[PDB]
Amino acid sequence: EDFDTRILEVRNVFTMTAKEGRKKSIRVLVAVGNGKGAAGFSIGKATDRMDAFRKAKNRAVHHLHYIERYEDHTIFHDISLRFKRTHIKMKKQPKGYGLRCHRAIITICRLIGIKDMYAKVSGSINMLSLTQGLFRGLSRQETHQQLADKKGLHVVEIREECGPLPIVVASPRGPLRKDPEPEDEVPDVKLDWEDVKTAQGMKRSVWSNLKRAAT
């Protein structure tokens, strides 16, 4: 009773049979989630649409991921991934930002319990790949605690709204290293041109930052 189901896609797939010719089947993608991190998805197939809905709904609950939510409202860090030909680039956002993402990601996020996030889907906009990719990235996100333990260092959060106050969000449960992490003068990191282009005010889009209903 805690879990809620929401349809993502309904497709009329067809095969050819010797006796009848075109045989119509229903392929249904559904996502189930209780809103507290536990969410899954499944594909249900049946000649009747009701049977397809049921099969997908009941099978999705046996394939539940657990999503680590930072402060139970957003992701811990920005996740960029490619699943097959679909690119999903998700950004961590502050409280009150909303779900500025593809309608399907909005639906899945509400089931997971993420309230604030931005995501841009590029490449193929296949619904199967998007869902499978979204759950792949969110499942693999590293929490602040896991980072502190791996690095043996404090994770200190700097917030602009709190000035210079150092907020320690995670500390290493084991021994704390005494050597500071080597500060590379120039980071050899791969930058997304779309990010850099926006930061330099070089991106004019009439469709970006349009006023939309509360999500």
Binding site: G96, H154, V155, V156
Partner: protein, 295 residues
Amino acid sequence: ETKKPTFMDEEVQSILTKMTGLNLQKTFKPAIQELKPPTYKLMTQAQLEEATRQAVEAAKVRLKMPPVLEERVPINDVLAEDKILEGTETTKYVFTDISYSIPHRERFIVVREPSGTLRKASWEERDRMIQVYFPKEGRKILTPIIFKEENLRTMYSQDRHVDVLNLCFAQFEPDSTEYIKVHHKTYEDIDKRGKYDLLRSTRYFGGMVWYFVNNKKIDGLLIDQIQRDLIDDATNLVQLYHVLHPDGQSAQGAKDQAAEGINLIKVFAKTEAQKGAYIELTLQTYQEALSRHSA
């Protein structure tokens, strides 16, 4: 001969600075403003202590006490009286010198009245014109209605004293009548309802203490400090009172009895303090509790 300390004396500043206190969580409380994704740094304990130290340094700048100034004297100086121009114009002309690199208090703002008198602008007109031409963030040309008695009492009912004080600092100049009035009426409400903790770890505590000491009503603040186990601050408050009222019964009492530490509170409680009985009871309770923890 013997000059009584001013508010900006290093001694007074040290006393009032310590009395204020420094709660890093209150000074850097999260502001309800447009937000951005926070940043993260992997820091050692040594590095964490250095950042906290830098926050203490920044917080001490944010808490720098505004200087307490005496009410400015009205400007009433006539530069000229050209009686020939009487009756020619129906409205007065306000001429503001907008030369950029001039201190605002050194600018010439004059008014040609319909009678023909060229007079220097009043303090109020001067402040209005500087806002018209050199607009300051948070200042309005027309006095906001928040500063009316009825609107200021709602703010007090909600324990928004610091907000009233920040609004006043933005709107009015430190030596203006409106500025001094509002701070004096805020300080009074804090005293009546015992809300001294509202202004602690803020840049407005020193001014509140200065008002209380120079008006001889440090009783309520002393009680609160003792009830909160802040004897060091309470003793310093009594000491400061003596320095600003040296020819006083309590000052002579401490001199006669060479009182120090808690004794200063007792001497002041009986001689000058209006609520001598209540102070003794409050101080009594504390001293008893302290004796237990020592065991």
